[PDB]
Amino acid sequence: TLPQQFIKKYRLLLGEEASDFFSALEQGSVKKGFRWNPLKPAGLDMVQTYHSEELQPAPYSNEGFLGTVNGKSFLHQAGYEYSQEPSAMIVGTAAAAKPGEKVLDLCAAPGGKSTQLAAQMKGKGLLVTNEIFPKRAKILSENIERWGVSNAIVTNHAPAELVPHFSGFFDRIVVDAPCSGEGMFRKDPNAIKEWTEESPLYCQKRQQEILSSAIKMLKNKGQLIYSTCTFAPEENEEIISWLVENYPVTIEEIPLTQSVSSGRSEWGSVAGLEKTIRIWPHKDQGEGHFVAKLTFHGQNQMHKVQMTKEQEKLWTEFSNDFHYEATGRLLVFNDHLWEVPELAPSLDGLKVVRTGLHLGDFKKNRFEPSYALALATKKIENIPCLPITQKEWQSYTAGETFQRDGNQGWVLLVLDKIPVGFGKQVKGTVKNFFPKGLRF
Among positive and negative, which fits the CA dihedral 352, 357, 359, 360? positive
Out of 107, 179, 203, 229, the active site residue is 229
β 289-296/218-228 pair status: antiparallel
Residues 383, 356 contacting (CB under 8 angstroms): no
Q: What distance in Å separates the CA atoms of residue 332 and residue 350, rounded to the nearest whole number? A: 16
Pick from 390, 389, 354, 358: nearest CA to 371: 358
419 phi, psi to nearest 5 deg: -70, 120
How many CB atoms lie under 10 A from the CB of residue 317? Answer: 12
Q: What distance in Å separates the CA atoms of residue 328 and residue 341, rounded to the nearest whole number? A: 5
How many CB atoms lie under 10 A from the CB of residue 234? Answer: 20
* Residue 331: its H or E element: strand 329-333
Terminal Cα distance for the chain, rounded: 38
Q: What distance in Å separates the CA atoms of residue 393 and residue 420, rounded to the nearest whole number? A: 8
Question: Catalytic annotation on 203?
Answer: no
95 by DSSP, 3-state: which? helix
Longest Cα pair distance anywhere in the chain, in angstroms? 74
Q: What distance in Å separates the CA atoms of residue 334 and residue 186, rounded to the nearest whole number? A: 45
Residues 23, 277 contacting (CB under 8 angstroms): no
Q: What distance in Å separates the CA atoms of residue 35 and residue 95, rounded to the nearest whole number? A: 16
DSSP, residue by residue, 305-316: -SPPHHHHHHHH
SS3 content of the chain, % helix, strand, coil (to 5): 35, 25, 40
328 by DSSP, 3-state: which? coil
Q: ∠ CA 110-111-114 to the nearest 5 degrees?
A: 155
340 by DSSP, 3-state: which? strand
DSSP label of 274: G
Tell me which residues are annotated as active site. Answer: 229
